Design a protein around this ligand. Sequence first.
Ligand SMILES: O=P([O-])(O)O[C@H]1O[C@H](COP(=O)(O)O)[C@@H](O)[C@H](O)[C@H]1O
Ligand SMILES: [Mn+2]
Ligand SMILES: [Mn+2]
Ligand SMILES: [Mn+2]
Length: 391
Amino acid sequence: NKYKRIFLVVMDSVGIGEAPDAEQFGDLGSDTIGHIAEHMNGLQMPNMVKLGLGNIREMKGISKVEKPLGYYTKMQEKSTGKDQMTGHWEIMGLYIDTPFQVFPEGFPKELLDELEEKTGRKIIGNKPASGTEILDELGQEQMETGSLIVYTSADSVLQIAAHEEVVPLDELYKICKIARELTLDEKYMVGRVIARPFVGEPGNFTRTPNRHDYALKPFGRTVMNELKDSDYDVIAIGKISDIYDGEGVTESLRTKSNMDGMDKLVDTLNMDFTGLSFLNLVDFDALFGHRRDPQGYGEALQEYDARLPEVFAKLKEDDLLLITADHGNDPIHPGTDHTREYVPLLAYSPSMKEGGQELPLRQTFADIGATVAENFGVKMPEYGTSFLNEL
Ligand SMILES: O=P([O-])(O)O[C@H]1O[C@H](COP(=O)(O)O)[C@@H](O)[C@H](O)[C@H]1O
Ligand SMILES: [Mn+2]
Ligand SMILES: [Mn+2]
Ligand SMILES: [Mn+2]
């Protein structure tokens, strides 16, 4: 095998400019890194610059270098949707025709009617909200009536909140499983159904750790599945395991923040493994993109960049580092949804003694999965073209 270990880092939502099909999505003008760079009066990301970020595209504070450490290009999304599961499933070798939906005005009456019909319970709420806001507003009514608080967020989720002393946990989980079946429908396709049990009294409600998530499996066996089946390590860091519903995962490391995610990446550098370490840095999307906070996003990018030199120092001759993103989420863009954007691709190994070069543009995110598959000699994905031989 060419590389013993591959470290794949998804900077979640870190897009590099509108894709050719952005107009279909209402995403003309979208530019996640570029708009952040402008807001920051120049982004400080010297380590990404050294890798060749500016060679992909020059932006404020992000300039090209004569001799990038590794290889660079961008990738274009081939699948229909710009959601979390589409982008990640494509990266690992799939093609997803049917996109996951978001619900800024709440769920269609038809879906909620059927959920009521199957459960024998009333549904209240039906809007995007934080768990705190919705409990303050409807927690007391929920307790008194035994109704279900159904709500969403900026991502593809259907959340069901019920008080633990009013709706037994087991009943709440049964209800969520019913909701999970009903939402396997392209009209209502949510990425995740989430049980949100809570306790307390009006003016003092708290969500309990008895939260359960109900995800869909990827629409195909992924490169991760093939790695696991061939006895390779597949270490998932952060949201990765959840995003693939555990498919192909041999070890999962939970993270609490981007800095904690980098700490776990460092932990995996310290592990003797053969296979894939796969990190998702989610704060970019979860705290800043959807909340349209370019300052916070910019600060987070600078915090991430400052962590990289330690990563560079630990990489071995037979390690490969891949840095990419799944979609965009431009923090200076209308609405609260993701943006359809190209994503950067940086590919670096200390064995690249003369530095890297420009790669042909990746026509699908599955090019990453294809590269990983070829490296480890496992079954090649149906989609994607390996760039292993170019490195
Ligand atoms: O908590 P996480 O990282 O699993 O994230 C979870 O909860 C968030 C809601 O946050 P709130 O608690 O403010 O309602 C949602 O945006 C997200 O889709 C969901 O996976
Ligand atoms: Mn848009
Ligand atoms: Mn994402
Ligand atoms: Mn998102």
